[PDB]
Amino acid sequence: SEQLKHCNGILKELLSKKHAAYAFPFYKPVDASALGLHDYHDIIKHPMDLSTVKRKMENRDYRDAQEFAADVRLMFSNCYKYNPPDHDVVAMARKLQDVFEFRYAKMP
Amino acid sequence: SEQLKHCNGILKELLSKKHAAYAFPFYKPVDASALGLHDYHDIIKHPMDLSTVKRKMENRDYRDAQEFAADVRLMFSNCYKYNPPDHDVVAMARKLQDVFEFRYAKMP
Ligand code: NI
């Protein structure tokens, strides 16, 4: 419970206005068709995004902090796998992952 | 098996000379007494380091890639939790974590 509240706080921070300049690509599931990324679902077999993490937290799906962290990290991994490493979206993922990792490390 | 070989390859890369300039603090368990860090084990309840990850891989302890990644990430989290964020060791952890995350994302 306490560890999951820490996770929920992190989630709320990742969704907050403070980080929006680099968090916004991760707010919703990638709409591959809409973006013309017709290879997305051949490369990324387990899509993840912050709205899905939020649904899982609200539904009490996550049983521990490790499960939560694995999904947030999956989201970043998908970005690093799909996009060339010099693309702006990758720089955004790295910055948001920094925010996540530093606060996650302050695990009660 | 294939995913665990990918993990073992990553591990070997993290231990290789190519990354030694920033990987070396993570090679062995933190010797808190030797370094004068008498609060280390009060702050870090689950120490982790690359020699421990290697032992667990050689002993077939890891049953899947997620388990392996959780230990490598724990190692970095410990660094981010214990050290002020402007210390050189934190910069080293961030650089090694970049190496890890980008290659881990190329999960077969
Ligand atoms: Ni993890």
Curated annotation (Swiss-Prot), chains A, B:
It comes from the Eukaryota. Transmembrane segments: none annotated. Residues 1-107 form the Bromo domain. It is found in: Nucleus; Chromosome. Disulfide bonds: none annotated. Signal peptide: none annotated. Changing L35A: Reduced binding to histone H4 acetylated at 'Lys-12' (H4K12ac). Changing N83A: Abolished binding to histone H4 acetylated at 'Lys-12' (H4K12ac). The first bromo domain specifically recognizes histone H4 acetylated at 'Lys-12' (H4K12ac). It also specifically binds histone H4 acetyl-methylated at 'Lys-5' and 'Lys-12' (H4K5acme and H4K12acme, respectively). The second bromo domain recognizes and binds histone H4 acetylated at 'Lys-5' and 'Lys-12' (H4K5ac and H4K12ac, respectively). Chromatin reader protein that specifically recognizes and binds histone H4 acetylated at 'Lys-5' and 'Lys-12' (H4K5ac and H4K12ac, respectively), thereby controlling gene expression and remodeling chromatin structures. Recruits transcription factors and coactivators to target gene sites, and activates RNA polymerase II machinery for transcriptional elongation. Some specific inhibitors of BRD2 that prevent binding to acetylated histone are promising therapeutic molecules for the treatment of cancers or inflammatory diseases. ABBV-744, a small molecule, has been tested on tumors with success: ABBV-744 antiproliferative activity is mainly restricted to cell lines of acute myeloid leukaemia and prostate cancer and is able to displace BRD4 from chromatin. GSK046 (iBET-BD2), which specifically inhibits the second bromo domain, is a promising therapeutic small molecule for the treatment of inflammatory and autoimmune diseases. Belongs to the BET family. Homodimer. Interacts with E2F1. Interacts with (acetylated) STAT3; promoting STAT3 recruitment to chromatin. Interacts with CTCF; promoting BRD2 recruitment to chromatin. This is Bromodomain-containing protein 2.
